[PDB]
Short mmCIF file of C-alpha atoms and ligand atoms in Angstrom, two decimals:
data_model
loop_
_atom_site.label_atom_id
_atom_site.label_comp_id
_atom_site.label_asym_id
_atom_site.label_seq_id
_atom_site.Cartn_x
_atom_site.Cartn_y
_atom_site.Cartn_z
CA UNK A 19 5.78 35.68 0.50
CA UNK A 20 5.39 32.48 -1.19
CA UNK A 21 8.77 32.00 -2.42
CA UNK A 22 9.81 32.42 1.18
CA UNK A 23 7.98 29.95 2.95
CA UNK A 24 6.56 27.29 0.48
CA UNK A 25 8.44 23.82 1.31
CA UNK A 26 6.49 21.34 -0.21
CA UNK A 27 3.33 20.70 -2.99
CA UNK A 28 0.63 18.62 -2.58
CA UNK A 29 -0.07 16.88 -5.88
CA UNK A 30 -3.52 14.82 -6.20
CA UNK A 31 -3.27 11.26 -8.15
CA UNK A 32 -6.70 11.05 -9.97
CA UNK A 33 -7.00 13.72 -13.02
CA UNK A 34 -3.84 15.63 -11.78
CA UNK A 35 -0.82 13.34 -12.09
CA UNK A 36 -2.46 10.44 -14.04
CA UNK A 37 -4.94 11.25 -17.14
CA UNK A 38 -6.92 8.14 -15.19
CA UNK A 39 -10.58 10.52 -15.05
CA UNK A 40 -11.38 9.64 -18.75
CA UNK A 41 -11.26 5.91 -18.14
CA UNK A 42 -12.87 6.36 -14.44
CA UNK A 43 -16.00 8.38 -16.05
CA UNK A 44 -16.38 6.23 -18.80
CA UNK A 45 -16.42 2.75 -16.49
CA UNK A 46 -18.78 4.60 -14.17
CA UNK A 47 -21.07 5.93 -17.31
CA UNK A 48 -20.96 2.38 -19.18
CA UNK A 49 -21.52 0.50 -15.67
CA UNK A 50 -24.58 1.99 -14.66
CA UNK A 51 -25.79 2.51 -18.55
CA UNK A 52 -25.78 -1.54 -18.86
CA UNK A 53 -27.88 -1.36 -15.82
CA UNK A 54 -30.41 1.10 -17.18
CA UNK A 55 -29.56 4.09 -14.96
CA UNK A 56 -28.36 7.42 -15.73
CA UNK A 57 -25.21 8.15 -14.39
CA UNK A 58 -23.49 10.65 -17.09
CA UNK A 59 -19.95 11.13 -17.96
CA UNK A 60 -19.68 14.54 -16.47
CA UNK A 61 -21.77 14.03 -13.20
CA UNK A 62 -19.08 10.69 -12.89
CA UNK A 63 -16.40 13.82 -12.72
CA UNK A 64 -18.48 15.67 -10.31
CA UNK A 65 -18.16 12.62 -7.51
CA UNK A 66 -14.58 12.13 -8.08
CA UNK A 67 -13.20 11.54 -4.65
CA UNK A 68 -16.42 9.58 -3.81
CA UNK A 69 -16.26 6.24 -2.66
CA UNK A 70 -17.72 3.99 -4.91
CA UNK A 71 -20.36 3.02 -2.31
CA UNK A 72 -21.76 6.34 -1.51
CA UNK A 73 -21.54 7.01 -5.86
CA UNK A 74 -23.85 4.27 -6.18
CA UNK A 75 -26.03 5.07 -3.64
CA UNK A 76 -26.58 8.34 -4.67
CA UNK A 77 -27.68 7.26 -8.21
CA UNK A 78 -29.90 4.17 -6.57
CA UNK A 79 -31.56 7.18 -4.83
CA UNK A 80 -32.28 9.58 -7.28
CA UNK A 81 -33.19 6.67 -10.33
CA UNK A 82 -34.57 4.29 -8.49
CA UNK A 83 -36.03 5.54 -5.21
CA UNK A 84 -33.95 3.48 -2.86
CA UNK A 85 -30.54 2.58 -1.68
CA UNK A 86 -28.34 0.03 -2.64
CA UNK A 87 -27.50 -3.20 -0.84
CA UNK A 88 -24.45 -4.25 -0.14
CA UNK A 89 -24.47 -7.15 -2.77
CA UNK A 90 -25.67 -4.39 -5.47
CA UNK A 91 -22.61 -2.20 -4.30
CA UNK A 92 -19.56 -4.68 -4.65
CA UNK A 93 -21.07 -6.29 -8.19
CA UNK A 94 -21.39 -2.43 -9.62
CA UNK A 95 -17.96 -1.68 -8.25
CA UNK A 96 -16.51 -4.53 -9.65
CA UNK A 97 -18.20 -4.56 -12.90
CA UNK A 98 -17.01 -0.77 -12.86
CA UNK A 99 -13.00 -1.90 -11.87
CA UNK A 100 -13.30 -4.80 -14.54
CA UNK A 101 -13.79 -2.22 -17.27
CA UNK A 102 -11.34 0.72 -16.42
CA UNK A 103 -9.13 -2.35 -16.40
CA UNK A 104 -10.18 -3.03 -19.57
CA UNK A 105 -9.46 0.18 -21.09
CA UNK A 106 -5.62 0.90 -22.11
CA UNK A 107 -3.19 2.00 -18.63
CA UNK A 108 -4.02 5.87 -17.91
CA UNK A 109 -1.21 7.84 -19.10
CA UNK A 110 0.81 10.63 -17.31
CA UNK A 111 -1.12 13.54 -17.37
CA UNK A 112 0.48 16.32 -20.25
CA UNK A 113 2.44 18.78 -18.05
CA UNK A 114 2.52 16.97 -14.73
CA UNK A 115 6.57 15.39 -15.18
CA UNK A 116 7.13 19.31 -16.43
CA UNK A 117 5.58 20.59 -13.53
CA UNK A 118 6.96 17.92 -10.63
CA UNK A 119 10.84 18.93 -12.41
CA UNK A 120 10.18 22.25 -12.23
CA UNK A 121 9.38 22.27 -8.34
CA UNK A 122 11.97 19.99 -7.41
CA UNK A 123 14.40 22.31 -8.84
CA UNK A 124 12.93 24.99 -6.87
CA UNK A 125 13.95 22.92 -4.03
CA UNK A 126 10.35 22.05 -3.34
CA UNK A 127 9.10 18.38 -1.82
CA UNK A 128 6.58 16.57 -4.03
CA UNK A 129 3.79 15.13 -1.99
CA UNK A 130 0.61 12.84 -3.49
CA UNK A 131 -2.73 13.05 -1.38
CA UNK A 132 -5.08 10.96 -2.93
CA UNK A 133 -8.50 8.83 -1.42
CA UNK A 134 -7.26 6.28 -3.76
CA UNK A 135 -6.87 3.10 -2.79
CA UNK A 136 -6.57 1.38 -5.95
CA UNK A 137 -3.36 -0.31 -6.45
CA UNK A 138 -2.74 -1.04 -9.95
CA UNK A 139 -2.25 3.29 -9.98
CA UNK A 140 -0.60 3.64 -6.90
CA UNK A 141 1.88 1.01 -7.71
CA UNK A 142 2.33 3.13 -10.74
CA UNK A 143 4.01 6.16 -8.78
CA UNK A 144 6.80 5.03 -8.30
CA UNK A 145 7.08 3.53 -12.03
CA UNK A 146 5.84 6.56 -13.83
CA UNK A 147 7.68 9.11 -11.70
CA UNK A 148 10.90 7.92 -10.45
CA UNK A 149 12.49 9.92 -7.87
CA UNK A 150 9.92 12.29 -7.31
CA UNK A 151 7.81 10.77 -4.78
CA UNK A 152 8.52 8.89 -1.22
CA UNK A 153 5.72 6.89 0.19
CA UNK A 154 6.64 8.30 3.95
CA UNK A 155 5.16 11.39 2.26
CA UNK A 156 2.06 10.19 0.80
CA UNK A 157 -1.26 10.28 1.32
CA UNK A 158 -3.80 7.44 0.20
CA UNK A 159 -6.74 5.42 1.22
CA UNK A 160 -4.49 3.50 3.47
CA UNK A 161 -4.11 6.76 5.77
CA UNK A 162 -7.33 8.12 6.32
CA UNK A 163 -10.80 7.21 7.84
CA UNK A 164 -12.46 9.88 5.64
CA UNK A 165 -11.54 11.21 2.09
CA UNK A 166 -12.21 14.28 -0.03
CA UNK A 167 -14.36 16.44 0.58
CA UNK A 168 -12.85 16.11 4.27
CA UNK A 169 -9.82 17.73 4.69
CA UNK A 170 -8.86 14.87 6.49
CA UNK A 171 -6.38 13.89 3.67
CA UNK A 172 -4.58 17.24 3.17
CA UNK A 173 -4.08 17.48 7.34
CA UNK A 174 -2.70 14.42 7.01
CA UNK A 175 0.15 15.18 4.22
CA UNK A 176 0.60 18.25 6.35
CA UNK A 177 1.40 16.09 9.21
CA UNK A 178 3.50 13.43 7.65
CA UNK A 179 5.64 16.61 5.65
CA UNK A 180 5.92 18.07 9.17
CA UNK A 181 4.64 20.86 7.69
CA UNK A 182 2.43 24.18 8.25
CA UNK A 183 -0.59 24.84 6.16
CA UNK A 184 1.61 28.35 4.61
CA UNK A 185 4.46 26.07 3.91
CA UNK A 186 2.09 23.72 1.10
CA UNK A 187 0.09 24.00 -1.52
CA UNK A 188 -2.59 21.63 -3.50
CA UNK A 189 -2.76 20.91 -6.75
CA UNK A 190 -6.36 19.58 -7.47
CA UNK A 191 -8.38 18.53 -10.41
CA UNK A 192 -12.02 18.03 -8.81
CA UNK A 193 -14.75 19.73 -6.90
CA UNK A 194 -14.03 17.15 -3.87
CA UNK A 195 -10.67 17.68 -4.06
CA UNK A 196 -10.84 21.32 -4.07
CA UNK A 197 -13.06 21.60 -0.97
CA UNK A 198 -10.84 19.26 0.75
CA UNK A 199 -7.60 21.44 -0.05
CA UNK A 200 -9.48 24.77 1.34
CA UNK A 201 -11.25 23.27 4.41
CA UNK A 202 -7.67 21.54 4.92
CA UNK A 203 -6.73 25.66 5.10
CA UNK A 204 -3.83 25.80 2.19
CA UNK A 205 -3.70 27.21 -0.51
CA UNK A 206 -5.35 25.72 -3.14
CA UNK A 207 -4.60 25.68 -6.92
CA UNK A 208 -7.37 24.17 -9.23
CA UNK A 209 -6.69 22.36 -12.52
CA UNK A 210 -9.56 22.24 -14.37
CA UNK A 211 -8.36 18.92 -16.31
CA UNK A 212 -11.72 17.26 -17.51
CA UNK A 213 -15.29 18.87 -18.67
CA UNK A 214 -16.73 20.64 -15.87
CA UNK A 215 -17.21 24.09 -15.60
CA UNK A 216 -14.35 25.89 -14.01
CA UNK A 217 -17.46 27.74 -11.48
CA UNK A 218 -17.83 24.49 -9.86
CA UNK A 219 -13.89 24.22 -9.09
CA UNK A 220 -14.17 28.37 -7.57
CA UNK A 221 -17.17 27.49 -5.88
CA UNK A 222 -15.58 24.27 -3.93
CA UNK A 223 -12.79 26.87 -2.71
CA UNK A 224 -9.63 27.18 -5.46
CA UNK A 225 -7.68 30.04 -4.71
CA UNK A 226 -6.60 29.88 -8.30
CA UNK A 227 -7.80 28.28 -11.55
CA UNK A 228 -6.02 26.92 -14.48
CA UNK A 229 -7.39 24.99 -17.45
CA UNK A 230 -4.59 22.35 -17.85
CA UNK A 231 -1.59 20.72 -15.71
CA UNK A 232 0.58 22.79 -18.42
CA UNK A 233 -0.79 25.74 -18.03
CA UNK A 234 -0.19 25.92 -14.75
CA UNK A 235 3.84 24.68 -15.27
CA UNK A 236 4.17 27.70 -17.68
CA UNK A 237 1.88 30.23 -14.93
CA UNK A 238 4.10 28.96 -11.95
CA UNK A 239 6.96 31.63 -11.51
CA UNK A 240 4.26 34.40 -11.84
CA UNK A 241 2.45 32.22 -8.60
CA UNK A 242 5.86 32.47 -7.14
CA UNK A 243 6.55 35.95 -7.39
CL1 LIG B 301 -22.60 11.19 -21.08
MG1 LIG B 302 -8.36 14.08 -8.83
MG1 LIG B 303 -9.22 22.42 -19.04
#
């Protein structure tokens, strides 16, 4: 009974709303590739929800045998932030203004729950999506002690909505994102937006897969029924 008691869906930022994962895997890649270790595009997708300090340490460990300091940490991170910056402004993601209309019509509430706390995107929110969003019903970096995989995140919009894990559902682009959605106990819908294989996206928990933000706007009255 979906139709019946669904009030509200959780969108994620990263890869879901914003077509930002390109530019974030390609800064990450280029980053550590100037600093001759091997961090490749599509492991860079694999760590999305990551901070950037525990991303970097696991690549100091594996390449180099060690962990990073502190200093080593907030020059990566910044050389990283410099060139995403660099790169032209993430676009919209194809489908997700299709999508966010279509559930608002349905009389649903658009939520974001994102680990994000990087302000040039969610500054970008409100600009990009006009009316769909309030930021008494988001999620971000600013909220939580612990993001994705937690569930921390997704408890959280469910507390802010004043809602009931049956009355939600997550929309989710990444491994992280997914396990955080299931552990979080609501149903979980993965979008399998970037190059990873779709496994990886069952395996972290998605109740259902689809291969594009589209896809799923065209699939979602057959979810509903
Ligand atoms: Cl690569
Ligand atoms: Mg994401
Ligand atoms: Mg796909």
């Amino acid at each position: 009974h979906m139709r019946k008691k669904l009030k509200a869906v959780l969108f994620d930022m990263d890869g879901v709303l914003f077509n930002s994962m390109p530019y974030h895997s390609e800064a990450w890649h280029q980053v550590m590739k100037t600093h001759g270790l091997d961090l490749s595009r599509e492991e860079a997708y694999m760590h999305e929800g990551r901070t950037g300090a525990s991303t970097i340490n696991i690549v100091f460990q594996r390449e180099l045998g060690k962990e990073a300091t502190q200093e080593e940490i907030e020059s990566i991170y910044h050389e990283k932030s410099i060139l995403f910056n660099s790169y032209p402004e993430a676009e919209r993601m194809p489908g997700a203004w299709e999508l966010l209309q279509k559930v608002k019509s349905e009389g649903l509430t658009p939520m974001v729950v994102t680990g994000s706390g990087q302000l040039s995107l969610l500054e970008r929110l409100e600009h990009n999506f006009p009316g769909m969003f309030h930021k008494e019903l988001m999620v971000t970096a600013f909220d939580v002690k612990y993001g994705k995989p937690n569930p921390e995140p997704y408890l959280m919009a469910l507390k802010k909505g004043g809602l009931k894990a049956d009355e939600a559902v997550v929309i989710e682009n990444a491994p992280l994102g997914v396990e955080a959605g299931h552990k979080a106990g609501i149903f979980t819908i993965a979008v399998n937006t970037g190059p990873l294989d779709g496994q990886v996206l069952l395996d972290a928990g998605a109740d259902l897969l689809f291969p594009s933000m589209q896809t799923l706007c065209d699939s979602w009255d057959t979810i509903m029924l």
